[PDB]
Symmetry: C3
């Protein structure tokens, strides 16, 4: 076995630096393209919703190579030269005051290797293995040391999502860890350098949050995983873009993940793994599908639908806990689609005379759904099944009290 | 230094696959032997308690190579071929319904590498670095990605005990991590890929739970460790089978661990590390002994007895917290044997005029035991010791209030 | 890339063993020097405060090579020979009883590789990857297995601070993890083998606790980091001794860290990284400075002062939570210096017409400080700023209720 070259830091939604016309970032808010050249060096920011901000043009002169874009600011970063220091620059436009942009130099011999924007704050991972926090208005906040060289960073609300190198992988594998922090009034380290699961012989392609606030990331083998707060903060695979690829040379380039409605916003690519900058590629929508067994049979189909519903509605409870604004109609509807799938699966299981499986499915139901399944059973009629469902209902009522 | 070959997945209680007549699994519930051959391919399940189920014979045809056995089901698993997929098969016999067995195919190019049974559920770790959960009745449940290739899995109640590869060890050492999950109504990740302690230049030989529900595992150097819930979920060594070995070629092959009464059920082996399938080996009982210093002196003897009692009665509090059924007489008796050992150790320490050590031991006592030690001291008589014990008793009463 | 030689265990505050007259330990309590020689082998203990204990001289005969010193005991440890076992020896002098010292042998072929003293207890990390706990009076307590070979251990109160090897680093880097435990009535594992951040191509030079009880450690590249309990138990850099070094050959040798008053007690070194034993080196005091950007400007200066105050007063809340004795005047004064820095930074930000930044700073203020900033704004007068501060004050009052 022999040591795997350790992946270099990158910005999710960016195309390589050697390009003449590259994407600095493409996310759910807009696009930031750079145009480096011997003649001019331009940067331009477009917004998907042209009402959030006007198209912004900047005369690139500091050779900013990293950028992130939020609904409230533009973050740019450049490494150091023999003349100048590595600089972090911010155009927080949503500000109500006259002074609009700030810029700060890192100490000598420290180079910005990754950046990201959250809600009201920005973060920079540097060559000194330091994480430096800022308000969008330019106030330096806490600083702490990283457990290893950064690979990529994402931000959402008060959450900071860091991926780095735990150590050295072997035979094509990376060895990445994740540090997950919450930067509110009550600071928390949700994930203390947990090992980051990847497909073997693959590297990290994309990281970020869904619009609703759930951490997600994408393999180089097309496998899309999402944090599963309802399962002990494990990582559940929710897509595999390779099944939407026709040849080995085909890839999908992720730009966005949305939970409600569910949609994987990516850009189809044919030659390489990233789209050429022009003509402007069309954003394709890929459906999420969890890698369940026997997906063609009705049972497996419905099981996949059920668990997809569950994991894609954990975020509602996350918004509720942290006092964010959520719409309880969506919780209700999530419940009812899940109970409908459970009822259909119990009917299906019942027509196959697998009544123990029916009781198992009823364990996942609400009391009302169970009360209804008791009658359904009492009509096939699996009378013993009806009794077992009745005892289960008694047990549920004993748990509520 | 040079990279250690990374141990292959295995099933605790199994003998190698190349054998003609092998043990697929030997645990506290029964034995599953396989007999692969060019003539016939048989599988047979025996039960230690012949009242739990009748001896079961299956006409092996799918070349199942992995198996686990619980008090309610038989789990079998086979990898994929060029013709067929990797299959998970279950004979849940304790079911009250007619339909008894189910079987499901994994997706194409995914191979089952480990399996285990819990209470009402089964789990499969696969070649895609996926953990797939099932009800014993065949309902697919949650799926999540593993941080590394699996080594072995065990299940008990709602607990899932996963051991895998954090990374690459060097100079004979493995680099294994443990993920410990609880799969009840409230999902929990107890251990987030904690590093799994091992003896140097040793690999993982056996993992599982004690009958009472505590995670345990065994080195290849004979060292038996158990989770210590009373010590921050660290891992405490509770045995060393090598001290019951007379020559380097002698080994003990673990099949069971019991906490009350304490017994390490293993099978003595002379030629190799595993028993030949026939004649049927006799299960030997080894005593647990924690690796304490100066075990021959009365002080060290009693210290070992004390801490053994403590760690082997943490499981009672675990059953109590999770609403399982425990017998409070056992808690009471555990308390009284511990207080007796403490009292004997305080008397011993007192006859050596080490009175500070006496007070230290009294810090571990109940109020009644301390109140009695005050008099004992008042009779040697270390009068100052009596006062220090009195002030300690006052402090204890201040802590209770 | 190629495997880094894995650093050997060491005792913080010690000079190499090959020296004729070496420091066994130098901490905030005193100094323990050893003098190994073919003629005599002496050990002597001095106390900074000559009232804690008298100078102690011991006729070294067991060739003790490890030592630690606390305000209540002297801990010594020697490896095993072909004749004798590895021994742990303790002179607990603060005891009120006649019997003063104890000594215990480790099992055969187990060698003490690290030791440390806490409050009322001592710990030994051994060649069997075991951690063995003792009372200072000689009672063996819990034992548990280490996830890797120890590098160094420190103790303070009920806290146990372990640093070890997670795995193998590459290209000059170590791969160290930290296990942080609390050994009170309620045992806790605060840190489950978290990755220990280090400067690249550097090893671990010093570990310990501040006098007030906060874990700290020092790079071989002079960077001093401290646990940040107010930031999710991350690690914040609080010093860089290299900036107090004039040439590459200059180093500082840490002996103590104090939080209130803030002072980094170290010894300046010119030839090597450690001081010669005589003449007795003078303890220098280095100021802590967090690595903030643009430290020369008034804004950066004040930001550094603010965050230094915050992190150096987390320990007060730690003492409060665990029922230790703290002085609430220090909490009050910490608050007022922080509010003064915030007020000065808001005035500075206001004179630059960056009013959004002013509101951001006010988010960190107390209600009274905000109420005062409302008037200040109302006088520049940024009237809109005054209103935004007023709405912020309303929001704060809504949070308190």
């Amino acid at each position: 076995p022999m040591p795997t070259p350790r992946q270099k830091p990158f910005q999710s939604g960016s195309t390589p630096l050697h390009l003449t016309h590259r994407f600095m970032v493409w996310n759910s808010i807009g696009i930031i393209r750079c145009y480096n050249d011997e003649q001019d060096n331009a940067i331009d920011v477009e917004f998907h919703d042209t009402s959030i901000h006007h198209a912004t043009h900047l005369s690139n002169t500091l050779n900013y190579t990293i950028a992130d874009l939020s609904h409230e600011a533009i973050l740019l970063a450049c490494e150091s030269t023999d003349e100048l220091a590595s600089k972090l620059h911010c155009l927080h436009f949503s500000s109500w005051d006259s002074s609009k942009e700030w810029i700060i130099d890192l100490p000598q011999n420290e180079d910005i290797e990754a950046i990201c924007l959250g809600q009201g704050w920005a973060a920079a991972a540097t060559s000194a293995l330091l994480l430096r926090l800022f308000t969008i208005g330019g106030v330096q906040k806490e600083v702490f040391s990283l457990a290893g060289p950064v690979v990529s960073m994402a931000g959402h609300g008060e959450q900071l999502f860091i991926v780095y190198h735990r150590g050295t992988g072997f035979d094509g594998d990376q060895c990445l860890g994740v540090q997950l922090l919450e930067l509110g009034k009550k600071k928390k380290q949700i994930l203390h350098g947990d090992p980051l699961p990847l497909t073997r012989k693959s590297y990290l392609a994309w990281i970020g949050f869904s619009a609703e606030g759930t951490p997600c990331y994408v393999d180089s083998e097309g496998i899309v995983r999402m944090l599963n707060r309802g399962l002990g903060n494990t990582w559940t695979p929710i897509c595999n873009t390779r099944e939407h690829c026709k040849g080995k040379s085909d890839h999908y380039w992720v730009v966005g993940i949305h939970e409600n409605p569910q949609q994987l916003r990516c850009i189809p690519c044919k030659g390489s793994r990233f789209p050429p900058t022009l003509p402007r590629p069309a954003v394709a929508i890929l459906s999420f599908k969890l890698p369940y067994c026997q997906i063609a049979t009705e049972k497996g189909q419905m099981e996949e639908q059920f668990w997809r519903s569950v994991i894609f509605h954990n975020h509602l409870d996350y918004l509720a806990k942290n006092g964010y604004e959520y719409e309880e109609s969506t919780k209700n509807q999530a419940t009812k689609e899940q109970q409908e799938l459970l009822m259909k699966m119990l009917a299906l299981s019942c027509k196959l005379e697998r009544e123990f499986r029916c009781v198992e499915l009823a364990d996942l139901m609400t009391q009302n759904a169970v009360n209804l399944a008791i009658k359904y059973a009492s009509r096939s009629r699996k009378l013993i099944l009806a009794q077992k469902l009745s005892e289960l209902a008694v047990e549920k009522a004993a748990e509520l009290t």
